Amino acid sequence: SVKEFLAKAKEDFLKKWETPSQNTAQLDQFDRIKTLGTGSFGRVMLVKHKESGNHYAMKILDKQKVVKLKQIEHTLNEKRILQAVNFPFLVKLEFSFKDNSNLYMVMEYVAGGEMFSHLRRIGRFSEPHARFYAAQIVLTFEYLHSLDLIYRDLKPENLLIDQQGYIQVTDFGFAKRVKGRTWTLCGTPEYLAPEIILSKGYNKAVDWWALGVLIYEMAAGYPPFFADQPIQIYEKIVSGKVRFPSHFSSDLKDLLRNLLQVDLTKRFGNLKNGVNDIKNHKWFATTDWIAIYQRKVEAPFIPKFKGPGDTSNFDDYEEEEIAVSINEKCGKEFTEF
């Protein structure tokens, strides 16, 4: 049963939520190999755990940069939630710790690369290809939302492809446990729901909107709202006009009209029927939800894998010296990390 599974999942989550894991490794236990991705203020590096020989992906956050960008509470949210969740399509946090300068989150290394890079290279995914990935996000949001979690940064750049061709969601940077509504302007411009842009107070329905944008971008090769600058993107989003490529199927367009829906009383995922309005939509008719969950469905493609610590599926980045300090920075702000 779904109710039985979710009831057990919530019990599991709450135990870890209430007593988070803390300080479970240290920096000199890893060799830092190569940068896998860099943002405005996070760096993720391929590392090798010396004692086990395992490769991991280590997210490094400069505490001082976190403070300057007013991301303290978000970063605490990020680690507290990621350490507490457990789902087949969520990246696993193995260790976390901090030093004088930085915060560290050590995840399983997902070697297949970002969905983003494959999507840009191939141009677009076929509808069945897009559906395979979309099904996994649907189940993932069902899991997250049941725990009163909002994810808040769905995009191809935060979705990794594993050795079996399945999705691993990374970047819990804006994840938040909230029962009521919330107000923070965060996400990625192309993926923001109108209510975020318009400072209205919003809820988990923004994740469903974001799913609409994701499906569109996967199937079209480009987002439904694009421009050179964020402000121009926001105008298009608030406008609530979406044009679909002529190759889009009738079922796909209908589903997207219901996800990319400005009216919250009408947006799929947010109605009385909740997630089942999406699961039961004609576009997903060929989807076997249990088989997706159990990872028994054949993947559209398997990424190339040359070796245990191969980074071929990732762009190269300029390397930077790790921040180091003789004195502890921002001790009080990150005491719980």
Partner: peptide, 19 residues
């Protein structure tokens, strides 16, 4: 084409989150 327009735009690379 919309695709050509996108490909010529300034946001075809990895997009950073905003806060």
């Amino acid at each position: 084409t919309t695709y050509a327009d996108f490909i010529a735009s300034g946001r075809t690379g990895r997009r950073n989150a905003i806060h």
